[PDB]
């Protein structure tokens, strides 16, 4: 990474990043199967199995309540409205039955929906299996204080996924803000990334940054159908990788004239990538996220701009107020300190206390020169790479 300090504008350009552009959304539908708990009943009073059974039963009822309320009258409102649309499609009667039948023979299928879209469809059957073959028989005619403790404790550990799913959806009106491991385990995430409609290289990159894949998605409850729970998970599709990107950070550049401040400030800070078609600008910090040397940007947040990176002759984006703003702006490889208007600005080390006081007027600190820069008892920790 090459960070260059442009002193005329109080700015940094940090160069040589590599892009990962979200270009679409993959949809994975889940059927978590609880199995027939309706006819299982305990009549021998307090019991670990009775409580975990009652807990399952009441989770089913809670989810039925949550789905009832869900009535048409790190996720963009854009991303979520997209997902709600997909979910309306899947919540039809026909479509649910289609998916249930697609998963009769196998554990995992590519179901097509009535509009044409293809969705992955997983069956999570561990609880129904445990309930149908292990628990129903160990409950001998309504008696749950079974002497087999290993069985009891297994029930307790087998419905953990279901109840956690029911908690996450019920606590968010059926739209979780991100993707817990109860919604989609890491196995299932990797399996679903590998089936995405893109080429093997983007799939490779995604599988190397699974956690970043998961950060950008979310879940929507579909409904409760019998003793099964249908929900969906939207994974991001990084359909385009490895175009070059740079970040521009800046602060105010004022000259002082005995009372009067003659200021300058760039208004083009953010992330840029020269990918194919245009040069693209991502203006908000939430928009692009770095891991190591790759920068992951939501293409929905992109503005197209022209060729640039001069000083300013061309018409660069900059300000000309008479008003100062003292502040710190942390670049990938350091800091830009903008000191004005009666305030005390300094460098700091985590070993040696106060390394070098700073002078009024925008200084630039490489991160190998400090661990800290403060402006009047507000302390900024520099980024270390």
């Amino acid at each position, epitope marked *: 990474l090459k960070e260059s300090y442009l002193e005329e504008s109080c700015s940094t350009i940090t160069e040589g990043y590599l892009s990962v552009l979200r270009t679409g959304w993959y949809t994975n539908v889940f059927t978590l199967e609880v199995g027939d708990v309706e006819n299982l*009943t305990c009549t021998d009073g*307090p019991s670990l199995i009775k409580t975990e059974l009652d807990l399952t039963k*009441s989770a089913l*009822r809670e989810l*039925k309540t949550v789905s009832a309320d869900q009535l048409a009258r790190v996720a963009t409102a854009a991303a979520v409205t997209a997902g709600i649309a997909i979910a309306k499609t899947i919540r039809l009667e026909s479509e649910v039955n289609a998916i249930k039948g697609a998963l009769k023979t196998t554990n995992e299928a590519v179901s097509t929906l009535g509009n044409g879209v293809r969705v992955l469809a997983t069956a999570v059957r561990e609880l129904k299996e445990f309930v149908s073959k292990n628990l129903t028989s160990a409950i001998n005619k309504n008696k749950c204080d079974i002497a087999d403790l290993k069985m009891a404790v297994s029930f307790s550990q087998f419905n953990r996924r279901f109840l956690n799913v029911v908690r996450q959806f019920s606590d968010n009106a059926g739209i979780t803000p991100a993707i817990s491991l109860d919604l989609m385990t890491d196995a299932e995430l990797a399996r679903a990334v590998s089936y995405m409609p893109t080429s093997a290289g983007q799939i490779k990159l995604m599988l190397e940054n699974r956690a970043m894949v998961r950060r950008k998605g979310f879940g929507i409850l579909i409904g409760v159908y019998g003793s099964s729970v249908i929900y969906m998970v939207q994974l991001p599709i990084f359909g385009v990788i490895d175009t070059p990107c740079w970040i521009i950070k800046a602060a105010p550049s004022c000259s002082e004239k005995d009372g009067n401040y003659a200021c300058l400030l760039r208004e083009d800070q953010g992330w840029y990538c020269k990918n194919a078609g245009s040069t693209v600008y991502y203006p908000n910090e939430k928009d692009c996220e770095t891991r190591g040397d790759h920068v992951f940007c939501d293409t929905a947040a992109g503005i197209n701009v022209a060729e640039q990176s001069r000083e300013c002759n061309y018409p660069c984006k900059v300000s000309t107020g008479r008003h100062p703003i003292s502040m710190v702006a942390l670049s990938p490889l350091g800091a830009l300190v903008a000191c004005y208007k009666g305030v005390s600005c300094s460098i700091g080390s985590n070993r040696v206390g106060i390394i070098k006081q700073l002078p009024k007027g925008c200084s630039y600190i490489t991160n190998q020169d400090a661990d800290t820069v403060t402006i009047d008892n507000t302390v900024y920790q520099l980024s270390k790479v």
Partner: antibody
Amino acid sequence: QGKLVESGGGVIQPGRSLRLSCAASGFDFSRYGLHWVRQAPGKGLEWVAVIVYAGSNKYYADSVKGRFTISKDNSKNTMHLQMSDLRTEDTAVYYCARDQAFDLWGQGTMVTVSS
Amino acid sequence: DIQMTQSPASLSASVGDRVTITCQASQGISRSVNWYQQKPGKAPKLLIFDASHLERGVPSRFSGSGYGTDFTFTISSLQPEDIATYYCQQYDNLRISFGQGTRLEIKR
């Protein structure tokens, strides 16, 4: 089994607030939700509100939607109903019931809404 | 929401006879119906859960039938201490709801 004990019913003026309480012993209060249901002298049983075992989800009968609030404290094993803006219709015996294992009710307290 | 509607309004019958209360659910709640007995100035007592299961120590006489929307509580031979009011309750989901109740009276 264990039991449910309600407390804090009494007389209260029409438009003030009152906080009812329910004390759990003898069962795994942390893994059961509970209900409040009331019956006005004479009349039948009417469901009032429910809270889930986690304490983080609540639902109300429309009678008392917007005035009553239900809460659950697993630390002290106890559930509460905070009634506000009481009307004369609220006069009733207030009952604590365990959800999903419905055999266990409290004995009641009388909330008498009179000036 | 979900409406239980309980019949008859009230019931009078001589000690020994056959009592039959019926509850009808506004929608199909499948077997999620309890039957409660309550004697005046006392907390209700659960007799039948899951529309047909007798609670423990409840006598041979009591029985529940139903699946779907139409349920039936039944006593075979009424006895003195069976005089009370009976309520059905549904628990299809978290929003439970009760029937209007039915009042039993020894006939004379």
